[PDB]
Amino acid sequence: QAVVDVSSHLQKMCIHNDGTKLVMLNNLKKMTNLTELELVHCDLERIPHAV
Amino acid sequence: GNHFEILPPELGDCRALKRARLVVEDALFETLPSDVREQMKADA
C-alpha cells in the first residue's frame, strides 16, 4: 500500500519479479496517474483485471 | 504534472520556447509531431 501513498503523482512504475505470482492487484487499481506499467514475469497466467 | 493526453503541433509555433524551456511529460512530448519535436530539440 506504500505505493498508494505516491500514486497521486507517480507516472511510471516497473516491477519485475523473478517468478513470484502477483496474486493480488488491489493497490494497482489506485494508480490513476500511472501512464506506463510493466508486469514482467508476474506469473499471472491471465490478463490482470487491475490494468 | 497535468492530465494532458495529446500535445498539439501548435507548441512548435512558439519560437522562443524550446525543449529546455518546455516542461512536459515524456509521453506528452512524444505526442508532438516528429518535425515539431526535432525543431524543439535541434535544428532538424
UniProtKB/Swiss-Prot annotation, chain A:
It is found in: Cell membrane; Endoplasmic reticulum membrane. It comes from the Eukaryota. Expressed at highest levels in skeletal muscle, and at moderate levels in heart, lung and peripheral blood leukocytes. LRR repeats lie at residues 8-30, 31-51. Belongs to the LRRC8 family. Heterohexamer; oligomerizes with other LRRC8 proteins (LRRC8A, LRRC8B, LRRC8D and/or LRRC8E) to form a heterohexamer. Homoheptamer; inactive, likely because it is not targeted to the plasma membrane in the absence of LRRC8A. In vivo, the subunit composition may depend primarily on expression levels, and heterooligomeric channels containing various proportions of the different LRRC8 proteins may coexist. The volume-regulated anion channel (VRAC) channel forms a trimer of dimers, with symmetry mismatch between the pore-forming domain and the cytosolic LRR repeats, a topology similar to gap junction proteins. It is linked to Telangiectasia, impaired intellectual development, microcephaly, metaphyseal dysplasia, eye abnormalities, and short stature: An autosomal dominant, pleiotropic disorder characterized by variable features that include telangiectasia, gastrointestinal vascular dysplasia, intellectual disability, skeletal dysplasia with fragile bones, short stature, and eye abnormalities. Patients exhibit striking cutis marmorata in infancy. Non-essential component of the volume-regulated anion channel (VRAC, also named VSOAC channel), an anion channel required to maintain a constant cell volume in response to extracellular or intracellular osmotic changes. The VRAC channel conducts iodide better than chloride and can also conduct organic osmolytes like taurine. Plays a redundant role in the efflux of amino acids, such as aspartate and glutamate, in response to osmotic stress. This is Volume-regulated anion channel subunit LRRC8C. The chain holds residues 558 to 608 of 803 of the full protein.
